[PDB]
Every structure is written in structure tokens, then in C-alpha cells.
Chain A
Amino acid sequence: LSVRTEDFFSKEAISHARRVSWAPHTTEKKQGAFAKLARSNFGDPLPSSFAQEPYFEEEIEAHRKHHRPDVYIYKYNVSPTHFSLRE
């Protein structure tokens, strides 16, 4: 092949869930916005590792997770988005 500009600069290894969007205007780093705002280059390495045992909980939609109604059927909670055991 030949020398290509695509291979010059490395991209971020951010995950799909931790991503904001797959748009080409959001492919870059998240701190670059504040770096451009401050007019300074930030070279902070190793920001953080995940964990020794990184566990997470299921997140619900911004409105559902707080306005879930207490609707039940025979022994299970019922929501337009989730099922769960009720006692």
C-alpha cells in the first residue's frame, strides 16, 4: 500500500455503552471540548481504570426510572418496558 493520513492519529477506545454517539463530530475525546474552550493542550495520562470487579445496575429511561407506576399482576410487576418478580 502507501502512506495514508488515516493511520497518523490514534482514536479513543471508548465502549459502546459509555459512548455518547457514533457521530463523526463526537468520535473525538470528550475532554477536547473543554481543552478547546480553555485554549490549552491537556496531556493527562491514565485517567482511570475500570475496577477490580466493575459491576453495574440496569439503568432505566430518564422518565420511567422515576415515574414507574406500582402496577402489579398475579405475582409480578408490570411496566410498559420491564417485568420483575414481586415478592
Chain B
Amino acid sequence: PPKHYSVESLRTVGLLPAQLALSRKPRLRPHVGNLKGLVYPLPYYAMWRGNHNKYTYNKSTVCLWGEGDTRSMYHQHYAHAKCPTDYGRGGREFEYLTVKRGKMLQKPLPRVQYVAEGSKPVWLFKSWHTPLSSPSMWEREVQYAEHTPEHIGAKRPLAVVAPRTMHRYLFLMHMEKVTITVSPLLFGYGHTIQKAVLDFYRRAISARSPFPKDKVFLFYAIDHITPRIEVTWLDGTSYVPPVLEGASSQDLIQMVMEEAWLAADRMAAEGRVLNPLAIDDYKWDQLVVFKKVRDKE
């Protein structure tokens, strides 16, 4: 006969289970003399209320934002994160158990839109074997042909979720060239725009690349041309980050790096073979700086 694990088998192994009925220790039933009336087999559903089931006829309770009668008032987060009908009791009155009467109505599930009927989509297998930094982890999982941009030349739709990274340096691997035009003379009043563009050129020269001098170029415009940056990608497409008043070199780097990620995604969708990111001497120097910071604090 087939054998299975049992309490006697576990005892012979050397482990005894806890006593359920016959034991001189507490049986953990706080409702035996506290909860009155009908009690449900779900354990501890009324302990946060104060171990009682009184005063249930109340409708409105004391509640913070997102609880109770907050639905009638506007809050930026909850107005998009909570349905105005899913507001329940707040505080210690959280509904761990709810019982109602009537015929239950189960609304139909939402339907995926902008999907033509009879379309066989491509399925992308996402696994942890693929590094998280690869755009394939951010690419769509159920990708249809009606979502692929063919005018750009893509074989697959573009990624819908972008990485959340504060970029402090530039990565010039997916960038054919960077031209930075500045004015030779220095403005009389403190020109934060000029300072930020000069800092951007400095960080682009110090960017992460085997030789960023081959891709970074500086130009002077005696025609009083406003300082500007022009990044030409590998496919020839050009991006011009608008340098407005108040923007810093870190902001310009963040913009350029986000657009570089988007451009590399477009390349990969078009079919372009891109060189991957890996460990290099720049990363070793950043490790030196990281160890310095760790030793400091």
C-alpha cells in the first residue's frame, strides 16, 4: 500500500505536533467570553476593534485620507489610486470580515482595448536569467502587430515602462556624436544656462566611454547663438535638449540619458545590433569613488 506522512511517522522521526484539545496551555480563543451572539470560524476577525462585535450599525467613522467619507473630497493620489466605491471603515474598524445579504452581482472583467479581433500576438518570455538592465525586461509581454510602429521601421512595439534611474554621468555608446555650441564671450549677469552647458560639456568629456573625445565636440558661435546641445544617435536621428532657465548639468544629463534609452529601444526594435553595457576602467574608477564614499560615511 502507498505510504504517506502522519503524526506517528513524524514522532518516530523525532518531532511531536502541538496539542489541540488536551493541553494545560492557553487555547487562544479571545472570543469565548467577549464576543456576543454569532461568531464566525475565521479567527481573530474582531481583535483590532477591541475584541468585541458591538456598534456595527455605524456608517461614518473617524478616517484619514483614503478612508471613510474621504470619497466626497478630492485628493490627488486617491483620486487615481482608489475607486470612490471601495471606501470602507478607517482606523481600527478595518473590515477583516464582511457579511451582507442580497444577490451578488459580479461585474464583467475589463477588456484590453486597441486589439483587433483575430490577431495572434507574439509572447515574450521574461525570466530572471536575463539581466534587469536589458530593455527586454521593460518590453511589452503581450505584443500585437497593431501596436508595432512600422513607419519608424520597427519589427516589434516599443517598451512601455522606463527605468527609474537618476543619471549622474553620460554613456556615449549608443550615440554617434555630441556637438555642444556655446558663446565665446561670457554674459555680464550670471548666466546659469551658460554655466550648465559648460558643466555638461565637462561631464561629457569625462563621460563613460573608451574615448569620449571621438564623440564629444565643442563649438563657439560668435553670432550670439544661444548655447545648445545636439546629440546624433547611431541611426542619424538628432536630439536637442532644450536648455531653459534653471536647468542644471544633472538635469541635462538626465534628459540626454532618458532619450538615449528611448533611442536604443528604437534601435533594438528596428533590428539594430547595439553594443551592451559591461565592466570597464570607468566602472573601476567609479568603484574607487564608491569605496571612498563608503569609507567616509
Q: Are A23 and B262 in contact (CB under 8 A)?
A: no
Chain B 116-129, CB-CB to A under 8 Å as 1, else 0, gives: 00000000011111
- Tell me the minimal C-beta distance from B261 to chain A in angstroms: 8
Contact with B along A8-44 (1 / 0, CB 8 A): 0000000000001101011010101100000000000
- Closest chain A residue to B265 by CB distance? A62
Of residues 147 to 166 in B, which have CB atoms within 8 Å of A's CB atoms?
158-162
Taking Cβ atoms with an 8 Å cutoff, the residues of A that contact B are 2-3, 20-21, 23, 25-26, 28, 30, 32-33, 53, 55-58, 61-63, 65-66
Q: Given known contacts A25-B127, A26-B127, A30-B128, is B158 in contact with A62 (CB within 8 Å)? A: yes
Main secondary structure, interface of B, reads loop
B58-86 contacts to A (CB < 8 Å): 65, 76-77, 80-81
B132 and A62 contact, CB distance less than 8 A? no
A58 touches B80 (CB 8 A): yes
Q: How far apart sit A73 and B261, CA to CA, in the bound complex (Å)?
A: 32
How big is chain B's contact interface, by range? Answer: 20 to 34
Determine if B141 is an interface residue (Cβ-Cβ < 8 Å).
Answer: yes
Q: Is the CB of A33 within 8 A of B132?
A: yes
Does B162 lie within 8 Å of A62, measured CB to CB? Answer: yes
Q: 5 A-B pairs, CB-CB below 8 angstroms?
A: A2-B5, A25-B125, A33-B129, A53-B65, A55-B77
A65 to B125, CA, bound (A): 26
The contact of A56 among B65, B81, B262, by CB within 8 Å, is: B81
Tell me if B160 and A61 are in contact (CB < 8 A).
Answer: yes
* Cβ-based interface call for B259 (8 A): yes
- Complex Cα gap A63–B157 (Å): 11
**Bound CA span A55–B138, Å:** 23
0 or 1 for each of B212-228: is its CB under 8 Å from A? (1 = yes): 00000000000000000
Contacts known (A2-B4, A20-B137, A56-B77); A66 close to B258, Cβ less than 8 A? yes
- Distance from B82 Cβ to chain A, minimum over Cβ atoms (Å): 12
A23 touches B125 (CB 8 A): yes
Rounded to whole Å, the gap between the CB of A8 and the closest CB of chain B is 12
Query: Known interface pairs A3-B4, A21-B141. Does A62 touch B262 (Cβ–Cβ under 8 Å)?
Result: yes
Chain B residues in 8 Å Cβ range of A62: 138, 158-162, 261-262, 265
Interface of A is mostly: loop
Taking the closest CB of chain A, its distance from the CB of B136, in whole angstroms, is: 11
Q: Which partner residue on chain B sits nearest A31 by CB separation?
A: B128
A17: min CB distance to chain B, Å: 9
Query: Which residues of B have CB within 8 Å of A21?
Result: 126, 141
Q: Is the CB of A26 within 8 A of B138?
A: no
Interchain CB contact under 8 A, A32 and B128: yes
Provide the bound-state CA to CA distance between A83 and B132, in Å: 32
Say whether, besides A63-B262, A66-B258, A33 and B158 are in contact (CB < 8 Å). Answer: no
**Are B159 and A25 neighbours in the complex by a CB distance under 8 Å?**
no
Least CB distance, B296 to chain A, in whole angstroms? 23
B128, A66: Cβ atoms closer than 8 Å: no
Task: Report the minimum CB–CB distance from A3 to chain B (whole Å).
Answer: 5
7 tightest A-B contacts by CB?
A25-B127, A62-B162, A55-B77, A33-B128, A3-B5, A21-B126, A61-B160
Residues of B close to A56: CB separation below 8 A: 77, 81
Question: A37–B239 Cα gap in the complex (Å)?
Answer: 37
Given contacts A33-B132, A56-B81, contact A26 B160 (CB under 8 A): no
Given contact pairs A23-B125, A23-B126, A33-B132, enumerate 14 new A-B contacts (beta carbons under 8 Å). A2-B5, A20-B126, A25-B125, A25-B128, A25-B129, A30-B128, A30-B132, A55-B76, A56-B81, A62-B158, A62-B160, A62-B161, A62-B261, A63-B262
